[PDB]
Write a protein that binds this DNA or RNA. Structure first.
Ligand SMILES: [K+]
Ligand SMILES: [K+]
Ligand SMILES: [K+]
Ligand SMILES: [K+]
Ligand SMILES: [K+]
Ligand SMILES: [Mg+2]
Ligand SMILES: [Mg+2]
Ligand SMILES: [Mg+2]
Ligand SMILES: [Mg+2]
Ligand SMILES: [Mg+2]
Ligand SMILES: [Mg+2]
Ligand SMILES: [Mg+2]
Ligand SMILES: [Mg+2]
Ligand SMILES: [Mg+2]
Ligand SMILES: [Mg+2]
Ligand SMILES: [Mg+2]
Ligand SMILES: [Mg+2]
Ligand SMILES: [Mg+2]
Ligand SMILES: [Mg+2]
Ligand SMILES: [Mg+2]
Ligand SMILES: [Mg+2]
Ligand SMILES: [Mg+2]
Ligand SMILES: [Mg+2]
Ligand SMILES: [Mg+2]
Ligand SMILES: [Mg+2]
Ligand SMILES: [Mg+2]
Ligand SMILES: [Mg+2]
Ligand SMILES: [Mg+2]
Ligand SMILES: [Mg+2]
Ligand SMILES: [Mg+2]
Ligand SMILES: [Mg+2]
Ligand SMILES: [Mg+2]
Ligand SMILES: [Mg+2]
Ligand SMILES: [Mg+2]
Ligand SMILES: [Mg+2]
Ligand SMILES: [Mg+2]
Ligand SMILES: [Mg+2]
Ligand SMILES: [Mg+2]
Ligand SMILES: [Mg+2]
Ligand SMILES: [Mg+2]
Ligand SMILES: [Mg+2]
Ligand SMILES: [Mg+2]
Ligand SMILES: [Mg+2]
Ligand SMILES: [Mg+2]
Ligand SMILES: [Mg+2]
Ligand SMILES: [Mg+2]
Ligand SMILES: [Mg+2]
Ligand SMILES: [Mg+2]
Ligand SMILES: [Mg+2]
Ligand SMILES: [Mg+2]
Ligand SMILES: [Mg+2]
Ligand SMILES: [Mg+2]
Ligand SMILES: [Mg+2]
Ligand SMILES: [Mg+2]
Ligand SMILES: [Mg+2]
Ligand SMILES: [Mg+2]
Ligand SMILES: [Mg+2]
Ligand SMILES: [Mg+2]
Ligand SMILES: [Zn+2]
Lengths: 110, 150, 147, 43, 307, 153
RNA sequence: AACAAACUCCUAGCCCAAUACCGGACUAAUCUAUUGAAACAUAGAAGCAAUAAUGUUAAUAUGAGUAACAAGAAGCCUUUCUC
RNA sequence: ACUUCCAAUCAGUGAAAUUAACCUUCCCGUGAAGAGGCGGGAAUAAAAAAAUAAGACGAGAAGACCCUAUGGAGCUUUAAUU
RNA sequence: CGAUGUUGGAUCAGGACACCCAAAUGGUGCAACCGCUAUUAAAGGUUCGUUUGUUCAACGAUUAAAGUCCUACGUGAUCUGAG
RNA sequence: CACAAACGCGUCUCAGAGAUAAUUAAUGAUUUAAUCUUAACCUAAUUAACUCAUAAUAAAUCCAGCCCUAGAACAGGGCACA
């Protein structure tokens, strides 16, 4: 079908500015206690997660160099140790990942 | 049309004509030329009628400023502050006299639509109609179906 | 409705004008006892359509008055007022009551009562004995006839 | 519901518009005037 | 002031979330168990049965369906309706609701306080009951009025009675004209092009419009419906379960409004029934575990012999 | 009418749905923390819960071995499942994995992301939403009720 | 009776409708001859005036942010898997 | 009944026929003879999204049918001239 | 005639009563049964098949009955194209 | 019927009062008979519509998130013991 007449701008403005078609505001925005940036209540902080993801990639990159083959996987548990630390008695019998940087604050040793 | 332009009520400035009549025209300024053929009507008016016009109307001040111009103009100012521009470009002598005489008789208010052809203050002599001006009063002011107190 | 239409519009005020909001409330009581002239109780019909197919309803004047007591008077006025958009506004000022049961709020607002447009004739039992003796006996019936 | 066939003022079938009491008086008033008209022309 | 949205669990600490749940839970049991004496807490006067009187219905939960057999060998299907928490909420005078019959308000099963409106929670606080899920209005004559806060049980209906059922049916969403109204479709293979389930012509040429009553595709299912003339076969006492013949509208685990049948044949069939309702305290006797209709084959009855 | 349907239509059909979750589950076992679309991660949670249940059965049970053969498409992860993941989970019954909503991906599609991981993984902890401390004003007021309640009852 | 016209009186006038064809008086904007010199006058000349040709060119809208278009997954980021 | 491509919501890019102006209702009557616009009556807070195609004598092609034009052309011959 | 798309079916039917059935009743060359005829009533209903492109008609089986007609002889921006 | 559902071929339910047209009968006058009466009063037998009894709907102002036998979007029902 084809339109019969040109829509006037008075009609178009009513349709294009109806409250349904407008952008709704968000009232669930909060400041992250740790870093002070912005995040939603039900969503993890973007800055804090990006902080973790960068560190996780570095740890995984070190693991790749410790298993050259593409089908080599450990048969035991894994523990990550940073500079200035030594494996504990309970941590023995597990593969050791060494990182040169100082242990990050958020990461907690057990 | 009437819906397009503004409107005003019939009003006389400063309650003119009540105690005494004051000619509301204040001054005129003629801007004519001494060489332009289109200013011939203005020049003939100045030589003949301007001197006699000033005598009849001592309440107006007439300024004549012959300067190089192409369209002769006459500017009339009134007491209330309204200035009205006019063009006397290429008009006969008697047409200028009629045009100037008309400017002398105008009150100076804006020439727009007048809503009513009359104006009055306190028109309600001997009272104005209200829905109680012709209804008889009932004994005791009783409503149509009101029960008496006793 | 003829006098009620005038009061609602304001055609009784010498200050009348359609643009102005001049208008007077009218309270009509005892609307169950209206008296249609002639056989209009059975001949006049009020018809309306609900919109849906097969929804054309025609109701006799007697049937409508038996269901909605004030419908006869309200429709009569609703058709006599001017057909502009003010008719809806000025119908809200019309108050109809089937009998003499008026809220005290409405009663305190009244001013005057309009006269009845039709003089109600009185029945035979309402004539006083003085009137009966005053009216002459037109004829003399025979004494031997049995009524 | 009931229609006048064709145009309502021309043809075989027309509108049944009757003569009114006002129209009868207008004819009589003109007739009385013309009755006086033909008397002043008589002599 | 653009105040942020909040919920009950937002600011509660991990050591207090279990505590608050215990706090509200203990309140519900105390409130529910304090209403179990309708005849010991100064109830409204009880009047004897009169012709043309109407009783008070219940709000029950639809469990499922079971087969049931009668003594003549026929098979019937019964729907298990369970009454979980039924209390009369408020009483409306005759002249303030309809002008002919009084209105009694009955609530549904218990729900959580944390997800109801402020006014709804405040209303129940004054009465002293936990919030209800569904609330319905019952038309009751003045001679069968019940004091608000009086509990109701499945024994309110005695087996042998015919009852109605009102509940929202199963919503099937935006369904086409063939499913919604049952129009026949166009043929499938004899050349038909892009037309197999469409309504087809919807009006006539002359009218140049579509009548308001025309059937068109739209919403189907999620509306209120009522089933009439459902006979009550078996009543269970301890679990408060009502067995109704046939199929009742509504999906499983929905709330169903039950009332006495209004059919002309089933009029005045309440003289031999509790009035205005079954009060367990007044009888001072234990009802049977299950109440059976006279035509029902009980599970502990000898097998049918047509001798 | 999708009443009672607990599964989701993903990929090119019912067969592609399994294979999409087969690759995701393989990545989850090897890396112990992966991120994908929220809808696909939600489906993957159900299988990751029950895969550990098959792992607890043992290395000798044939059904567990065949079930782990199909889902672990990389053949060097079967020994890991029966000797690392299964021994680690012996206490809890269903608390095997965590799901949290990662913010939307910084790309055109703007999909809703989620992060799925196994308990006790050898990775930095996620920024979990921490509840209010008991020293807060609202918590302190409520603790007053509990101390008084426990004193009498 | 009353209310009711382009009719007819009343008060001022510049003192009586129209399609094809025909008659007349003025006139917007250009150039030239003399004037004019904060933009005109008397004349002589013309590419001398666009609410209408499914008109031409260019720019804008409406239909419409509608129809329709695309990148297999995870990760250690380019290596393993699913087809 | 169930799947895939469409579909509806979100993010990116974003076209076409069409359009005198529209603040774009129903009924009966009228009328260049089938009215959203006239007359007599009815109905009537304003907008958005998704659907069905009765009407807008819907959109598309200066009707292929039919006739007219001292308008063309192809074919045939016992038309005229050659 | 700078276009009002043309038979029959399919889907959906809106309406009229000059009624085929269902309900009430008068008359009879109406004993009953089966009929003929007239008045009143339009809320609901009015079948499935062989041949023909067929509407129509013939024939088989059945039904309380298989009504007459208008609606662009309804309905192709919903379908069919046998004619 | 290879989903926890949908579906028919399967199962369930389906109503009282008023009111009428033709017609039939009682009482009775113009016409002291008779006569159902566009004569009055009262009253009787009586089509279908139609109207209504009755039934359904019912709480203004928690709502970020998750679930749902609620759903295109938007809405709606749950999230205390589960
Ligand atoms: K005619
Ligand atoms: K249409
Ligand atoms: K034509
Ligand atoms: K019919
Ligand atoms: K007689
Ligand atoms: Mg006509
Ligand atoms: Mg005539
Ligand atoms: Mg649904
Ligand atoms: Mg079919
Ligand atoms: Mg095709
Ligand atoms: Mg097809
Ligand atoms: Mg129409
Ligand atoms: Mg819908
Ligand atoms: Mg689902
Ligand atoms: Mg897809
Ligand atoms: Mg889920
Ligand atoms: Mg006049
Ligand atoms: Mg003329
Ligand atoms: Mg002509
Ligand atoms: Mg010139
Ligand atoms: Mg030109
Ligand atoms: Mg132009
Ligand atoms: Mg065109
Ligand atoms: Mg043009
Ligand atoms: Mg340009
Ligand atoms: Mg646009
Ligand atoms: Mg569109
Ligand atoms: Mg699309
Ligand atoms: Mg988009
Ligand atoms: Mg409008
Ligand atoms: Mg018409
Ligand atoms: Mg009108
Ligand atoms: Mg009109
Ligand atoms: Mg759309
Ligand atoms: Mg649409
Ligand atoms: Mg038009
Ligand atoms: Mg058409
Ligand atoms: Mg067209
Ligand atoms: Mg042509
Ligand atoms: Mg031809
Ligand atoms: Mg010719
Ligand atoms: Mg020729
Ligand atoms: Mg030629
Ligand atoms: Mg040639
Ligand atoms: Mg020859
Ligand atoms: Mg056209
Ligand atoms: Mg047909
Ligand atoms: Mg029909
Ligand atoms: Mg008839
Ligand atoms: Mg019959
Ligand atoms: Mg046709
Ligand atoms: Mg056709
Ligand atoms: Mg087509
Ligand atoms: Mg069509
Ligand atoms: Mg053919
Ligand atoms: Mg007699
Ligand atoms: Mg009702
Ligand atoms: Mg809710
Ligand atoms: Zn942060």
């Amino acid at each position: 079908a084809a339109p019969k007449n040109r829509r006037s701008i008075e009609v178009n403005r009513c349709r294009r500015r109806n409250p349904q078609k407008l952008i709704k505001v968000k009232n669930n925005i909060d400041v992250c206690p740790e870093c002070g940036h912005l995040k939603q209540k039900h969503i993890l902080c973007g800055y804090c997660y990006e902080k973790v993801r960068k560190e996780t990639a570095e740890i995984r990159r070190q693991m790749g160099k410790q298993e050259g083959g593409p089908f080599r996987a450990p048969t035991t548990e894994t523990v990550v140790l940073y500079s200035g630390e030594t494996p504990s008695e309970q941590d023995q019998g597990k593969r050791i990942i060494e990182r040169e940087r100082k242990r990050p604050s958020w990461f907690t040793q057990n | 049309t009437a819906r397009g332009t503004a409107s005003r009520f019939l009003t006389s400035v400063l309650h003119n004509g009540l105690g005494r009549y004051v000619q509301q025209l204040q001054r005129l300024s003629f801007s004519l030329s001494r060489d332009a053929p289109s200013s011939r009507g203005a020049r003939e008016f100045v030589e003949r009628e301007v001197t006699d016009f000033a005598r009849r109307n001592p309440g107006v001040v007439i300024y004549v400023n012959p300067r190089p111009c192409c369209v002769p103009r006459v500017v009339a100012e009134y007491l209330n502050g309204a200035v009205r521009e006019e063009s006397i470009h290429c008009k006969s002598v008697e047409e200028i006299a009629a045009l100037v005489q008309k400017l002398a008789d105008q009150s100076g208010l804006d020439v727009i639509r007048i809503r009513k052809p009359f104006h009055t203050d306190s028109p309600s002599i001997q009272g104005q109609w209200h829905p109680f001006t012709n209804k008889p009063t009932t004994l005791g002011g009783l409503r149509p179906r009101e029960v008496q107190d006793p | 409705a003829a006098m009620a239409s005038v009061k609602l519009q304001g055609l009784h005020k010498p200050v009348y004008h359609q643009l102005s909001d001049c208008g007077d409330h009218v309270v009509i009581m005892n609307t169950r006892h209206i008296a249609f002239s002639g056989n209009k109780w059975e001949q006049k019909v009020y018809s309306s359509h609900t919109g849906y197919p097969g929804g054309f309803r025609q109701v006799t004047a007697a049937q409508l008055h038996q269901k909605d007591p004030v419908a006869i008077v309200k429709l009569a006025i609703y058709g006599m007022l001017p057909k502009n958009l003010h008719r809806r506004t000025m119908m809200q000022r019309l108050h109809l009551f089937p009998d003499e049961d008026i809220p005290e709020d409405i009663l305190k607002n009244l001013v005057e009562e309009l006269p009845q447009p039709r003089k109600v004739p009185r029945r035979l039992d309402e004539y006083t004995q003085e009137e009966i003796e005053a009216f002459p006996r037109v004829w003399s019936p025979p004494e031997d006839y049995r009524l | 519901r009931n229609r006048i066939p064709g145009r309502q003022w021309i043809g075989k079938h027309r509108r049944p518009r009757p003569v009114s009491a006002q129209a009868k008086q207008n004819m009589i008033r003109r007739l009385e005037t013309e009755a006086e008209n033909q008397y002043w022309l008589s002599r | 002031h653009g105040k942020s949205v909040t919920w009950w669990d937002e600011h509660l600490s991990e050591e207090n979330v279990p505590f608050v749940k215990q706090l509200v839970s203990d309140e519900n049991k105390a409130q529910l168990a304090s209403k179990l004496c309708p005849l010991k807490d100064e109830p409204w006067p009880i009047h004897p049965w009169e012709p043309g009187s109407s009783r008070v219905g219940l709000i029950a939960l639809k469990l499922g369906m079971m087969p049931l057999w009668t003594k003549d060998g026929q098979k019937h299907v019964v729907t298990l309706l369970q009454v979980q928490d039924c209390h009369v909420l408020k009483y409306t005078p005759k002249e303030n609701h309809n002008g002919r019959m009084a209105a009694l308000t009955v609530g549904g099963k218990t729900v959580s306080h944390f997800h109801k409106s402020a006014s709804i929670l405040e209303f129940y606080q004054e009465l002293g009951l936990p919030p209800k899920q569904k609330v319905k209005i019952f038309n009751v004559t003045e001679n069968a009025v019940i004091k608000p806060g009086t509990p109701l049980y499945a024994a309110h209906f005695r087996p042998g009675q015919y009852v109605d059922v009102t509940a929202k049916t199963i919503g099937k969403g935006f369904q086409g004209v063939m499913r919604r109204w049952g129009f026949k479709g166009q043929p499938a293979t004899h050349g038909q092009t892009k037309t197999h389930r469409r309504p087809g012509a919807i009006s006539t040429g002359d009218v140049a419009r579509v009548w308001p009553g025309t059937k068109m595709p739209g919403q189907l299912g999620n509306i209120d419906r009522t089933a009439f003339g459902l006979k009550v076969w078996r009543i269970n006492t301890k679990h408060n379960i009502i067995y109704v013949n046939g199929s009742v509208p509504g999906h499983k685990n929905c709330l169903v409004k039950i009332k006495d049948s209004k059919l002309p044949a089933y009029k005045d069939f309440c003289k031999n029934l509790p009035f205005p309702t079954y009060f367990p305290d007044g009888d001072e006797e234990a009802l049977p575990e299950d109440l059976y209709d006279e035509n029902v084959c009980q599970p502990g009855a000898p097998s049918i012999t047509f001798t | 009418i999708s009443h009672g349907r607990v599964f989701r239509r993903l990929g090119l059909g019912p067969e592609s749905r399994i294979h999409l979750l087969q690759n995701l589950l393989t990545g989850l076992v090897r890396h112990e923390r992966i991120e994908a679309s929220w809808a696909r991660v939600d489906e993957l949670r159900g299988y990751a819960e029950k895969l550990i249940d098959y792992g607890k059965l043992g290395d000798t049970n044939e059904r567990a071995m065949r079930m782990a053969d199909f889902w672990l498409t990389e053949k060097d992860l079967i020994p890991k499942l029966f000797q690392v993941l299964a021994p680690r989970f012996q206490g809890q019954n269903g608390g095997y994995t965590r799901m949290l909503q990662i913010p939307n991906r910084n790309e055109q599609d703007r999909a809703k992301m989620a992060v799925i991981e196994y308990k006790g993984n050898c990775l930095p902890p996620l920024p979990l939403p921490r509840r209010d401390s008991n020293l807060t004003l609202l918590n302190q007021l409520l603790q007053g009720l509990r101390q008084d309640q426990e004193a009498s009852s």
